Design a protein around this nucleic acid. Structure first.
Ligand SMILES: [Mg+2]
Ligand SMILES: [Mg+2]
Ligand SMILES: [Mg+2]
Ligand SMILES: [Mg+2]
Ligand SMILES: [Mg+2]
Ligand SMILES: [Mg+2]
Ligand SMILES: [Mg+2]
Ligand SMILES: [Mg+2]
Ligand SMILES: [Mg+2]
Ligand SMILES: [Mg+2]
Ligand SMILES: [Mg+2]
Ligand SMILES: [Mg+2]
Ligand SMILES: [Mg+2]
Ligand SMILES: [Mg+2]
Ligand SMILES: [Mg+2]
Ligand SMILES: [Mg+2]
Ligand SMILES: [Mg+2]
Ligand SMILES: [Mg+2]
Ligand SMILES: [Mg+2]
Ligand SMILES: [Mg+2]
Ligand SMILES: [Mg+2]
Ligand SMILES: [Mg+2]
Ligand SMILES: [Mg+2]
Ligand SMILES: [Mg+2]
Ligand SMILES: [Mg+2]
Ligand SMILES: [Mg+2]
Ligand SMILES: [Mg+2]
Ligand SMILES: [Mg+2]
Lengths: 64, 266, 145, 75
RNA sequence: AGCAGAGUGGCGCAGCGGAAGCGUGCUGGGCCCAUAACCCAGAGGUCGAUGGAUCGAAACCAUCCUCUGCUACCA
RNA sequence: AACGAGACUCUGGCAUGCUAACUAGUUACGCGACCCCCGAGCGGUCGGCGUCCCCCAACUUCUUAGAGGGACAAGUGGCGUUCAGCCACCCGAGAUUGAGCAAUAACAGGUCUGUGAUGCCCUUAGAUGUCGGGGCUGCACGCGCGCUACACUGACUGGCUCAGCGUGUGCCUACCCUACGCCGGCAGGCGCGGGUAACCCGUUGAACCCCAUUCGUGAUGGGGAUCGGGGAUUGCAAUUAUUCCCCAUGAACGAGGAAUUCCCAGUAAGUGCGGGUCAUAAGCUUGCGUUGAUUAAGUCCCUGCCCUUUGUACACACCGCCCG
RNA sequence: ACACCAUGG
């Protein structure tokens, strides 16, 4: 019930999912072990390479 | 003025709240079982099933009992929920709430003639009265209204503690008028079919045999509802100790009416 | 600073003492704000003291100006009542002279039943306004029978 | 709507509080004095100007819209 | 005549002393190309009448009146 | 092979290169004149301010408007079956300015009240072809396009300093835009010139904005409905108040339920100014500038549209058809 | 990885 923050760097933009095409699929690293990688769904206009912030690195969202 | 022994409600408590504004992702609602720190109920948590219009569930100015789930005891974020209530909780909360409201309005007259420049002296009186009043009776399940009850009947604890002036006046002269008759219901469920012509005197001697070990001055409430019945409202205490006055009383009546001529009831 | 009485009861109406004297006396009917500044200017009064900071003798100097404006050299185009229909005088009706002068004017109109008198009677709009979609006080009507 | 009570000229208690509030503040604007005291605001302006005429305060910026002061330019 | 229950918006009703709302109806509007369903605004109150307690009631107490069910059914 | 798309025509953005200008200018000095020392100096000279007056001085940067020039996905790097093309970047005034014009087939769309375009029907001297008066404005109520507001990111009172598109004496018809002087608080009045217009109104002294003063959270000095009294102009005539000015009266309204409209960069919005109608005269509309954002660079969810495949008992075409 | 969507001078 307590987890630290994690900071990921965007490495690729996949597509614009969501029902109105609002959120964006993105693949991130983890900036402490660059081996890790997940797919996340962001809400603003991501570019490439900028540092997101994850409040629960364990999830991995898979659609809209 | 604070309602209870803790200013911030704890988790898993049911609270009386007056909804005030239907938000975009919740509703901002007042707090009425605790002081008016805001509360936010999530819109995902009004009802367990799909809703046609929110005004059919909640609308500004409707007392309702809701359960808090989480709270930042520091910053002041009272997270509230309505899916998670049984209508019994509503009862056990609303009755104690309507008790606490009269205790609030009663502990208000002292500030009329005593210092009232600050809402904090209300807290001053609150910590000396309500905290100690419920720190005892909360083990079996009773509150400070029960203490004021035990007081205005036999005034014995208000003296046992620090005594005020004119506040025991506004205590009793309000409670024992709102603590007002607990109506009695014991009547004489006896059917007799008389066979004695001298019996009009038997009924009189049995009326004077109504309540035993007692006097000929204390009044009794006779009712002639059925001519073959003899119905009485006995020694009027509270409907809590005149039980034997129904348990044993009718016996002398039925026997003395049965002894004369012919067999009778019991 | 200046902790003596403030409120004053100028003729038949309670002039609050707090507001600036200009905006203080406007609580009199018939006396708007453009007329009040002229009255105060011709009264020589300072225009940076509230109603509470005037003694009992300046206020009479102001009253007598409000009542007799024509003679303190306030021109004949400031007065709200001009060539008065019944007698040719020019003056400012002040407090209940305004009520009675409106009352008398409506009576004067209705008496000869002019087209305006009847409009004041029937309670309608007296100038030339359309009335199909305006005013609109009454209650809704339904088509059901 | 309520009744924000305000005075147009001081009473002795409030006048004392004015001549003693000067150090207590690092931000002296007409609005804050009009709210912490029960001052109309056209009175707070005059009182602040009066104090400034006594060198008790230091004017840091005056504009047509907003005015400010400071504590003493000391300490 | 008696017992029990009830008397609150046009109508059915909720309302364990800090005090007027719910379902439906009426009037109007929204949605649709229209109409029903569905959504929202407004009006409508001697809380049966009379007194009393209470700091205060529609609510508690007392008297009376009016409806409903059931026996009593009574020169 | 033909049409539509595109090409095209107008417009906005760039030329210190060309053509050439008392109906546009600038710089210079020929000037001169005014004024201040404002600085060297003293006051002139050295200078500073000039929509002060000149030049038969020099030129075309600003102004005007003609001919040509320029931009092509042309260069460089990625992705492309190495095609058609897409993405980023360099140089640049600019790497997507805004409009006009528009197909085949249709609709029982609108218009006989634009027409001396028009078939048929009607009325035709007691007229359905002219003058005087009234109406289109009538108010219990339902809706639509709008204007002004609910104030302090404000209202009032002074002070300061900036535009662009335009129109202007009327052919019957009978009227135009206004300078400058004087009179009146104001609307307005009299007098005497310019303009058929880059020539005069006019350097179009526009509002918001900008700077300084009063008010103080109060339906208040916010807001300006409704109503009383008076004074002018237009016209043959102003009452049911044409418009306009002054004193006075001082309502609802404290950011608006269910719903729902418009919008992507000099755009939304705020702000004023010309054209149309116009004897008088915009809360309209058509254009013009002026201060100038937040959010997006997407999708097919909702409402719709285009192309292919598929199903149909529909073809007046799902607002269809049809069973008890 | 399916709430409700009837009718037509
Ligand atoms: Mg072009
Ligand atoms: Mg150009
Ligand atoms: Mg010049
Ligand atoms: Mg060209
Ligand atoms: Mg290439
Ligand atoms: Mg460049
Ligand atoms: Mg184009
Ligand atoms: Mg076409
Ligand atoms: Mg036609
Ligand atoms: Mg024809
Ligand atoms: Mg004719
Ligand atoms: Mg005619
Ligand atoms: Mg019309
Ligand atoms: Mg329209
Ligand atoms: Mg007209
Ligand atoms: Mg216009
Ligand atoms: Mg004109
Ligand atoms: Mg016009
Ligand atoms: Mg029009
Ligand atoms: Mg296509
Ligand atoms: Mg097919
Ligand atoms: Mg087919
Ligand atoms: Mg068929
Ligand atoms: Mg059909
Ligand atoms: Mg159908
Ligand atoms: Mg349908
Ligand atoms: Mg049917
Ligand atoms: Mg049918």
């Amino acid at each position: 019930r307590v987890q630290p923050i994690k900071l990921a760097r965007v490495t690729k933009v996949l597509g614009r999912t969501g029902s109105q095409g609002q959120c964006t699929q993105v693949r991130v690293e983890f900036m402490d072990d660059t081996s890790r990688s997940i797919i996340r769904n962001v809400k603003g206009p991501v570019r490439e390479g900028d540092v997101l912030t994850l409040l629960e690195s364990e999830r991995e969202a898979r659609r809209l | 003025c604070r309602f209870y022994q803790h200013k911030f409600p704890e988790v898993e408590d049911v609270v009386m709240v007056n909804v005030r504004s239907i938000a975009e992702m919740g509703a901002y609602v007042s707090l009425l079982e605790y002081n008016n720190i805001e509360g936010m109920i999530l819109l995902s948590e009004l009802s367990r099933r799909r809703i046609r219009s929110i005004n059919k569930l909640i609308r500004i100015g409707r007392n309702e009992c809701v359960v808090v789930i989480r709270v930042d005891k520091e910053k002041g974020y009272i997270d509230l929920s309505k899916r998670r209530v049984s209508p019994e909780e509503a009862i056990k909360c609303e009755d104690k709430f309507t008790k606490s409201k009269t205790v609030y309005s009663i502990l208000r007259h002292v500030a009329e003639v005593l210092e009232y420049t600050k809402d904090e002296q209300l807290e001053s009186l609150f910590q000396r009265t309500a905290w100690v009043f419920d720190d005892k009776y909360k083990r079996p399940g009773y509150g400070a209204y029960d203490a004021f009850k035990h007081a205005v009947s036999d005034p014995s604890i208000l003296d046992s503690l620090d005594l005020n002036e004119d506040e025991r006046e506004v205590l009793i002269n309000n409670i024992n008028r709102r603590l007002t008759p607990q109506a009695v219901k014991i009547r004489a469920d006896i059917e007799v079919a008389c066979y004695g012509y001298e019996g009009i005197d038997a009924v009189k001697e049995a009326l004077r045999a109504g309540l035993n070990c007692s006097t000929e001055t204390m009044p009794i409430k006779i009712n002639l509802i059925a001519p073959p019945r003899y119905v009485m409202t006995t020694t009027t205490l509270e409907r809590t100790e005149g039980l034997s006055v129904l348990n044993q009383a009718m016996a002398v009546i039925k026997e003395k009416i049965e002894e004369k001529r012919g067999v009778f009831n019991v | 600073p200046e902790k003596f009485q403030h409120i004053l009861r100028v003729l038949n109406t309670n002039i609050d003492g707090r507001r600036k004297i200009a905006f203080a006396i406007t609580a009199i009917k018939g006396v708007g704000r453009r007329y009040a500044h002229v009255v105060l200017r011709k009264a020589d009064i300072d225009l940076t003291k509230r109603a509470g900071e005037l003694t009992e003798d300046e206020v009479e100097r102001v009253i007598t100006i409000m009542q007799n404006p024509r003679q303190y050299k306030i021109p004949d185009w400031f007065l709200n009542r001009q060539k008065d229909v019944k007698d040719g005088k020019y003056s400012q009706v002040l407090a209940n002279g305004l009520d009675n002068k409106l009352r008398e004017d409506l009576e004067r109109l209705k008496k000869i039943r002019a087209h305006r008198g009847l409009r004041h009677f029937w309670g309608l709009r007296v100038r030339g306004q359309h009335t199909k979609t305006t005013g609109r006080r009454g209650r809704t009507v339904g088509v059901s029978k | 709507r309520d009744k924000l009570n305000n005075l147009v000229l001081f009473d002795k208690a409030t006048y004392d509080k004015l001549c003693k509030e000067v150090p207590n503040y690092k931000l002296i604007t007409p609005a804050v004095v009009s709210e912490r005291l029960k001052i109309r605001g056209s009175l707070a302006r005059a009182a602040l100007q009066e104090l400034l005429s006594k060198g008790l305060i230091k004017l840091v910026s005056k504009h047509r819209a907003q005015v400010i002061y400071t504590r003493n330019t000391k300490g």
